[PDB]
Amino acid sequence: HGLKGLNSKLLDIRSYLEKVATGKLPINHQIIYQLQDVFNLLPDVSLQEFVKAFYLKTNDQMVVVYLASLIRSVVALHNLINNKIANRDAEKKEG
Amino acid sequence: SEQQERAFTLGLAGLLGEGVFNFGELLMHPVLESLRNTDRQWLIDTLYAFNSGNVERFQTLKTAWGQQPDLAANEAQLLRKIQLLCLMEMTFT
């Protein structure tokens, strides 16, 4: 979706300039002037509130990665303890 | 010679309309731009003032120099239309 979105608008913007270079009339502008300004609607960068969204998004990843470390402790606890139990037991009983 | 005044009073009735504050896009329409070339350039320049402007107090007065009638009623409406027109262009520029 990313890369096909790159070459989509690329070749589509290649048609945007090619139609102005060759093919006139016209195609400019039944929609050219308004559509291209819709492209110029949002640049869209900070300052300001977009900086607040940054560390807020950082505050969003907090919980999920915190939970990630929680699953790490639970998965490591259960699997490692139980496996070493059944491991050391099978070795000491058979050997 | 007919279409120069035709697109003139068209530019008057279209610019003085309250429902359309600018519509500077269709002011550039290619079939009417040759009709605007025959027209005097004070109308085209003041249509660029309503295209961008906004003030540009000299051109909005120049259309009062060029067209005496029907402007006296809609003059204050045009001033309100350009005062709300600059708001999009100041954040867009």
Curated annotation (Swiss-Prot), chain A:
Record-listed N6-acetyllysine modification sites: 9, 19
Miscellaneous comment as given in the Swiss-Prot or TrEMBL entry: Does not bind a metal ion.
Function: Component of the 26S proteasome, a multiprotein complex involved in the ATP-dependent degradation of ubiquitinated proteins. This complex plays a key role in the maintenance of protein homeostasis by removing misfolded or damaged proteins, which could impair cellular functions, and by removing proteins whose functions are no longer required. Therefore, the proteasome participates in numerous cellular processes, including cell cycle progression, apoptosis, or DNA damage repair.
Family of this protein: Belongs to the peptidase M67A family.
Quaternary state and interactors: Component of the 19S proteasome regulatory particle complex. The 26S proteasome consists of a 20S core particle (CP) and two 19S regulatory subunits (RP). The regulatory particle is made of a lid composed of 9 subunits including PSMD7, a base containing 6 ATPases and few additional components. Within the complex, PSMD7 interacts with subunit PSMD4 through their respective MPN domain. Interacts with TRIM5.
Name of protein: 26S proteasome non-ATPase regulatory subunit 7
